Design a protein around this ligand. Structure first.
Ligand SMILES: [Zn+2]
Length: 117
């Protein structure tokens, strides 16, 4: 019969929460387009032999969700898929990433621990 007096009928898990919660962010997926550099450390490898005049720091790029494709000073976002070339002095690595691709789920909430609050 109705074990537990009901059997957790009202809300059980995501599959059930879908009725209201809904997992679909904005109906456009959101999985990384290059997990190879999902971790900051891994991203480091991306900048294997990072020049000294590129434009910005290699790590910072990783922290910004940018993976180097060996194309000179051209970096791209492995998450949403935002490539940017022809950088200039002053334009923050990801600062231009959002300007040309502001729909990056990483840009907004940053992602990763970095709780603080
Ligand atoms: Zn992005």
């Amino acid at each position: 019969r109705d074990h537990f007096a009901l059997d957790r009928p009202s809300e059980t898990h995501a599959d059930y929460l879908l009725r209201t919660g809904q997992v679909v962010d904005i109906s456009d997926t959101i999985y990384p387009r290059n997990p190879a550099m999902y971790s900051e450390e891994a991203r480091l490898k991306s900048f294997q032999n990072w020049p000294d005049y590129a434009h910005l720091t290699p790590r910072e790029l990783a922290s910004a969700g940018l993976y180097y494709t060996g194309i000179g000073d051209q970096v791209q976002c492995f998450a949403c898929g935002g490539k940017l070339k022809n950088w200039e002095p002053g334009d923050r690595a990801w600062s231009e990433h959002r300007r040309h691709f502001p729909n990056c789920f990483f840009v907004l909430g940053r992602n990763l621990n970095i709780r603080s609050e």
